[PDB]
Amino acid sequence: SVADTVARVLRGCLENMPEADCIPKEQLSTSFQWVTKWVDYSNKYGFGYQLSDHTVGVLFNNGAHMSLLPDKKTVHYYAELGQCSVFPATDAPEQFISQVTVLKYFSHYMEENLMDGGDLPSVTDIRRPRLYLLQWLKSDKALMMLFNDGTFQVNFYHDHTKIIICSQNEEYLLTYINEDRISTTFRLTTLLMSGCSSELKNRMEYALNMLLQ
């Protein structure tokens, strides 16, 4: 249903926007939560990412999810079945220890082998009930990540281009991160009217197809 909403929106814009050469000229200055780095170790432990605020998250293979907050000290854990536990990392209870030291592993792999996926400015304050990954999908072309608040992100392998759909002031936004990791953020309402370049449009289409899976 979170997914239904994002699809409904993105199909809407895709089926209704015009033909264009260039991307839209009207562009915004803002920040919001998005995935700056990620790491797939799903063959063994699960899938990890880092967010814009420097929270580290991991979706484990068994369904559970852990986040390390930007203080590097505080953990938020959801079980498979939804149950939320919050405790500090170093004083973890027995049955979470293996997973915490894995969370930590992911944090340090990302910190010292990977670079930020984009030049969006770090969100200083993320205040809402905080994000966790609902769902991820990899095809041979791209990685798709969907968060509990509807934030939608797809990263293309070939050229490190990315698309991000989020909602900010009760409004839908799409940002394109290009080959140079420069970000441009539009109003969806704006893309609807003015359309965009075929390169962006094709990536939007590819993204939608990932969502309909």
Curated annotation (Swiss-Prot):
It is found in: Cytoplasm, Cytoskeleton, Microtubule organizing center, Centrosome, Centriole; Cell projection, Dendrite. Disulfide bonds: none annotated. Coiled coil: none annotated. One of its GO terms (biological process) is DNA damage response, signal transduction by p53 class mediator. Changing K162M: Impairs localization to the centrosome and centriole duplication. Residues 34-112, 132-213 form the POLO box domain. Its main location: cytoplasm. Expressed at higher level in the fetal lung, kidney, spleen and heart. Induction: Directly regulated by p53/TP53. Negatively regulated by miR-126. GO terms for cellular component: centriole; centrosome; chromatin; cytoplasm; cytosol; dendrite; kinetochore; nucleus. The keyword Iron does not apply. One of its GO terms (molecular function) is protein serine kinase activity. Keywords: ATP-binding, Cell projection, Cytoplasm, Cytoskeleton, Kinase, Nucleotide-binding, Phosphoprotein, Repeat, Serine/threonine-protein kinase, Transferase, Tumor suppressor. Tumor suppressor serine/threonine-protein kinase involved in synaptic plasticity, centriole duplication and G1/S phase transition. Polo-like kinases act by binding and phosphorylating proteins that are already phosphorylated on a specific motif recognized by the POLO box domains. Phosphorylates CPAP, NPM1, RAPGEF2, RASGRF1, SNCA, SIPA1L1 and SYNGAP1. The POLO box domains act as phosphopeptide-binding module that recognizes and binds serine-[phosphothreonine/phosphoserine]-(proline/X) motifs. PLK2 recognizes and binds docking proteins that are already phosphorylated on these motifs, and then phosphorylates them. There are indications that PLK2 might act as a tumor suppressor: PLK2 is significantly down-regulated in a wide range of acute myeloid leukemias (AMLs) and B-cell lymphomas due to aberrant cytosine methylation in the CpG island located at the 5' of the PLK2 gene. Moreover, miR-126, a microRNA that negatively regulates PLK2 is up-regulated in AMLs, suggesting that PLK2 down-regulation by miR-126 could also contribute to leukemogenesis. Interacts with NSF; causing NSF dissociation from GRIA2. Interacts with CIB1. Belongs to the protein kinase superfamily. Ser/Thr protein kinase family. CDC5/Polo subfamily. This is Serine/threonine-protein kinase PLK2. The lineage of its organism: Eukaryota, Metazoa, Chordata, Craniata, Vertebrata. The gene is PLK2.
